[PDB]
């Protein structure tokens, strides 16, 4: 009976978030491949992000099913019948997270190429390179998901998974801030007044805040669990693990609203779906 | 009995009374820091657009 009980969230919240994410990323995927108009590389990178989100929410659904199976006893409380299942499902989880991060990164890179290599973009980002880069990233994602779920609780594994957050975040910043500065340069020539733009700053803030608020809590929890399980304050932070998971899952729900639907063509594709 | 049994350790039973700072020091500090980071990004981007 400690002052920081391990907060247990109702299974309803997990189920609802996972179902919403699966459905939403499903309509995002359907908008592509049912609208051959939407077949540019950028929409394929958005589709990769949607697949990552779908895999994460699907992981959740499977993990809840397996937990409510162990509970109620349909599966043995321990043994290969549960430990290897946990390994494989949490592998799905880790590869979903890494795919999401690298999908955000490649979306940023594609946007950077479109802006700062506009006249030569289609020569640089072709469908061949689209497929090859997506395949390489997802192969890396699955391989290191296996690596980080089987060789999980070692310190260097935590170090690398942790570091993929700040380093990719600074990459995304270096890209988006440069695009924002170019937009400022254009705003100088568009109109005479200073006219400090808001939709650019608001857009970058929304993107980066969704990325951070939906990853920083989990990364902090992992770091504190690895380097400092003993400090009382730490332990009170770790008590909120399920909330931080919910946050690392809200990304799936709130990713399409910030990368997919803000394209008018994708909105139109969804409208015709209806 | 058991021996060299590696397993998921449970959360230490932290007692707030012994703690000097608030139990949730890390949570409040980190979330204030994240909100400050978001607001700083917004304000620095706005200033760069303005200047």
């Amino acid at each position: 009976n400690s002052d920081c009980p391990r907060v247990v969230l109702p299974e309803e919240i997990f189920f609802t978030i996972s179902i919403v994410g699966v459905l939403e990323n499903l309509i995002v995927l359907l908008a592509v491949f049912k609208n051959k108009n939407l077949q540019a590389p950028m929409y394929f990178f958005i589709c990769s992000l949607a697949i990552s989100d779908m895999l994460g929410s699907l992981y959740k659904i499977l993990e809840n099913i397996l937990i409510i199976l162990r509970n109620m006893g349909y599966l043995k409380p321990r043994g290969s019948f549960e430990t290897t299942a946990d390994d494989i499902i949490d592998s799905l989880f880790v590869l979903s997270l890494l795919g999401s991060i690298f999908s955000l990164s490649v979306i940023a890179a594609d946007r950077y190429i479109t802006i700062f290599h506009a006249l030569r973009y289609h020569s640089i980002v072709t469908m061949r390179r689209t497929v090859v880069v997506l395949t390489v990233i997802w192969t890396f994602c699955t391989g290191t998901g296996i690596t980080m779920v089987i060789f999980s609780h070692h310190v260097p594994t935590v170090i690398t998974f942790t570091s993929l957050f700040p380093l990719m975040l600074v990459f995304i910043l270096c890209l988006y801030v440069h695009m924002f500065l170019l937009a400022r340069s254009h705003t100088r020539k568009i109109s005479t007044l200073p006219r400090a733009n808001m939709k650019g700053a608001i857009t970058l803030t929304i993107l980066l805040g969704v990325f951070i608020f939906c990853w920083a809590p989990f990364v902090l929890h992992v770091l504190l669990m690895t380097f400092c399980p003993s400090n009382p304050y730490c332990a009170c932070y770790m008590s909120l693990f399920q909330v931080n998971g919910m946050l690392i899952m809200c990304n799936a729900v709130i990713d399409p609203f910030i990368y997919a639907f803000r394209s008018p063509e994708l909105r139109d594709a969804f409208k015709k779906m209806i | 009995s058991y021996e060299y049994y590696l397993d998921y350790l449970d959360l230490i039973p932290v007692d707030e009374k012994k703690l000097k700072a608030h139990k949730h020091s890390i949570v409040i500090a980190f979330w204030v820091s994240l909100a400050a980071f978001v607001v700083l990004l917004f304000l620095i981007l706005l200033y760069m657009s303005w200047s």
């Binding site: 997990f14 993990e63 809840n64 397996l66 937990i67 162990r70 321990r78 549960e82 430990t83 299942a85 946990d86 390994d87 949490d90 989880f93 880790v94 779920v149 999980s152 609780h153 935590v158 989990f218 929890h221 992992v222 669990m225 690895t226 399980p229 770790m238 693990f241 399920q242 998971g245 690392i248 | 009995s1 058991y2 021996e3 060299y4 049994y5 590696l6 397993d7 998921y8 350790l9 449970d10 959360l11």
Partner: peptide, 18 residues
């Protein structure tokens, strides 16, 4: 690896020998 937990890295790994 040693139990079904809702995510990975939920709790640390030590020697819970008994």
């Amino acid at each position: 690896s040693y139990s079904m937990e809702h995510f990975r890295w939920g709790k640390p790994v030590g020697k819970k020998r008994r």
